[PDB]
Amino acid sequence: GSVQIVYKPVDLSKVTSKCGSLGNIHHKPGGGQVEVKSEKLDFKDRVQSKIGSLDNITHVPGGGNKKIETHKLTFRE
Amino acid sequence: GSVQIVYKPVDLSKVTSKCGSLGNIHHKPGGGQVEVKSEKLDFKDRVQSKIGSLDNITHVPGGGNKKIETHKLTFRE
Amino acid sequence: GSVQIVYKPVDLSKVTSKCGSLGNIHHKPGGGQVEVKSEKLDFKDRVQSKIGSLDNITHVPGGGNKKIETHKLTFRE
Amino acid sequence: GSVQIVYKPVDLSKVTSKCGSLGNIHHKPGGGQVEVKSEKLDFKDRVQSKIGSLDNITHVPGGGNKKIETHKLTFRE
Amino acid sequence: GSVQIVYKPVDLSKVTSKCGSLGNIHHKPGGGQVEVKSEKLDFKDRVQSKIGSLDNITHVPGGGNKKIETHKLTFRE
Amino acid sequence: GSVQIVYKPVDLSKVTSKCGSLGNIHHKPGGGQVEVKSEKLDFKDRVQSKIGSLDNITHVPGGGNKKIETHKLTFRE
Amino acid sequence: GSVQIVYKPVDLSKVTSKCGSLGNIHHKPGGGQVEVKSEKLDFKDRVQSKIGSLDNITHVPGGGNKKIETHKLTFRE
Amino acid sequence: GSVQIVYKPVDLSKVTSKCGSLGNIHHKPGGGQVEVKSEKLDFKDRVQSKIGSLDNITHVPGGGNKKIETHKLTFRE
C-alpha cells in the first residue's frame, strides 16, 4: 500500500493601506484607583495572569496590517 | 490500496484600504474606582485571567487590515 | 481500492474600503465604580476569564477590513 | 471500489464600501455602579467568562468589512 | 509500503503601508493609585504573571506591519 | 419727653445630644458627567454663585448642635 | 428730652454633645468629569463665585457644635 | 438733651463635646477630570473666585466647636 501526499498551497495575497495624513491625537486619562485582595495563588500551566493593573496604552501605527498563516500536516500509522 | 492526495489551494485575495486624512481624536477618560476580593486561586491550563484592572486603550492605526488563514491536513491509519 | 482526492479551491476575493476624511471623534467616559467579591476560583482549561474591570477603548482604524479563512482535511482508515 | 473526489470551489466575491466623509462623533458615558457577589467558581473548558465589568467602547473604522469563509472535508472508512 | 510526502508551499505575499505624514500625538496620563495584597504565590510552569502595575505605553511606529507564519510536519509510525 | 428703654432678655436654654456608638458609614458615589455653557457673566452684589460643580460631601459629626441668636435694637428720631 | 437706654441681655446657654465611640467611616468617590465654557466674567462686589469644580470633602468632627450670636444697637438723631 | 447709653451684655455660655474614641476613617477619592474655558476676567472688589479646581479635604478634628459673637454700636447725630 503506497501513499502519496502532495502539499503545494500557493499564496499571492496582498494586504496594503494608504493614509495621506495622520495625527492630532490626544489621550488624557484621568487617573483612578484599584484595589485587589487575595491570599492563595497557584499557577502551574501556560498561564497569563494579570492582577491589579492600571494601564494606559496609546497605539498609533502608520501601518498595522497583520497577517497570520499556519500550516500543519500530521501523519499517523 | 494506493491513496493519492493532492492539496493545492490557491489564494490571490487582496485586502486594502485608503483614507485621505485621519486625525483630531480626543480620548479623555474620567478616572474610576474598582475593588476585587478573593482568597483561593488555582489556574492550571492555558488560562488568560485578568483580575481587577482599570485600562484605557487608544488604538488608531492607519492600516489595521487583518487576515487569518489556517490549513490543516490529518492522516490516520 | 484506490482513493483519489483533489483539493484545489480557488480564491480571488477582494475586501477594500475608501474613506476620504475621518476624524473629529470625542470620547469622554465619566468614571464609575465596580466591586466584586469571590473566594474560590478554579480554572483548568482554555479559559479567558476577566473579573472586575473598568475599561475604555477608543478604536479608530482607517482600514479595519478583516478576513478569516480556514481549510481542514481529515482522512481516517 | 475506487472513490474519486474533486473539491474545486471558486470564489471571486468582493466586499467594498465608500464613505466620503466621516466624523463628528461624540461619546460621553455618564459613569455608573455595579456590584457582584460570588463564592465558588469552577471553569474547566473553553470558557469566556466576564464578571463585574464597566466598559465603554468607541469603535469607528473607516472600513470594517468582514468576511468569514470555512472549508471542511472529512473522509471516513 | 512506500510513503512519499512532498511539502512545497509557495508564498509571495506582501504587506505594505504608506503614510504621508504622521505626528502631533499627545499622551498625558493623570496618575493613579493601585494596591494589591497576597500571601502565597506558587508559579511552576510557563507563567507570565504581572501583579500590581501602573503602566503607560506610547507606541508610535511608522511601519508596524506584522506577519506570522508557522509550518509543522509530524510523522509517526 | 423722656424715653426709657430696658432691654434685658434672659436665656438659659440648653441643646444637648447623646449617642452611644456611631459608625459603619459607607459613601460610594459613582462618578458622573456635567457640562455647562455660558458667555456673559456679571455679578455685582453679595452673590454666591456656583457653576458647573461635581461634589461629594461626607459629614459625620458626633455633635452638630446648632444655635443661632440675633438681637437688634434700632432707635430713630 | 433725656433718653435712657439699658442694654443688658444675659446668656447662660450650653450646647454639649457626647458620643462614646465614633469611627469606621468609608468615603470612596468614583471620579467624574465636568466641563464649563465662558468668555466674559465681571465680578465687582462681595462675590464668592466657584466655577468648574470637582470636590470631595470628608468632615468628621468629634464635636462640631456651632453657636452664632450677634448684637446690634443703632442710634439716630 | 442728655443721652445715656448702657451696654453691658453678659455671656456665660459653654460649648463642649466628649468623644471616647474616634478613628478608622478611610478616604479614597477616585480621580476625575475637569476643564474650564474663559477669556475675559475682571475682579475689582472683595471677590473670592475659585476656577477649575479638583480638591479633596479630609477634616477630622477631635474638637471642632465653633463660636461666633459680634457686637456693634453705632451713634449718629
Place this chain on the structure above:
Amino acid sequence: GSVQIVYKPVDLSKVTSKCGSLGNIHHKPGGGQVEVKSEKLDFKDRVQSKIGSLDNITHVPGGGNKKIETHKLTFRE
C-alpha cells in the same frame, strides 16, 4: 447736650473638647487631571483668586476649637 456711653460687655464663655483616642486615618487620593484656559485677567481689589488647582488637605487637629469675637463702636457728629 452731654452724651454718656458705657461699653462694658462681659464674657466668661468656655469652649472645650475631650477625645480619649484619635487616629487610624487613611487618605488616599487617586490623582486626576484639570485644564484651564484664559487670556485676560484683571484683579484690582481685595481679591483671593485661585485658578487651576489640584489640592489634597489632611487636617487632623486634636483641638480645633475656634472662637471669633468682634467689637465695634462708631461715633458720629
Place this chain on the structure above:
Amino acid sequence: GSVQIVYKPVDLSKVTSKCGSLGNIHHKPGGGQVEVKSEKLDFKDRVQSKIGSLDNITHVPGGGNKKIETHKLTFRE
C-alpha cells in the same frame, strides 16, 4: 457739649482641648496633572492669586485652638 465714653470690655474666656493619644495617620496622594494657559495678568491691589498649583498638606496639630478678637473705636466730629 461734653462727651464721655467708657470702653472697658472684660474677657475671661477659655478655649482648651484634651486628646489622650493621637497618631496612625496615613496620607498617600496619587499624583495628578494640571495645565493652565493665560497671556495677560494685571494685579494692582491686595491680591492673593494662586495659579496652577498641585499641593498636598498634612496638618496634624496636637492643639490647634484658634481665637480671634478685634476691637475698634472710631470718633468723628
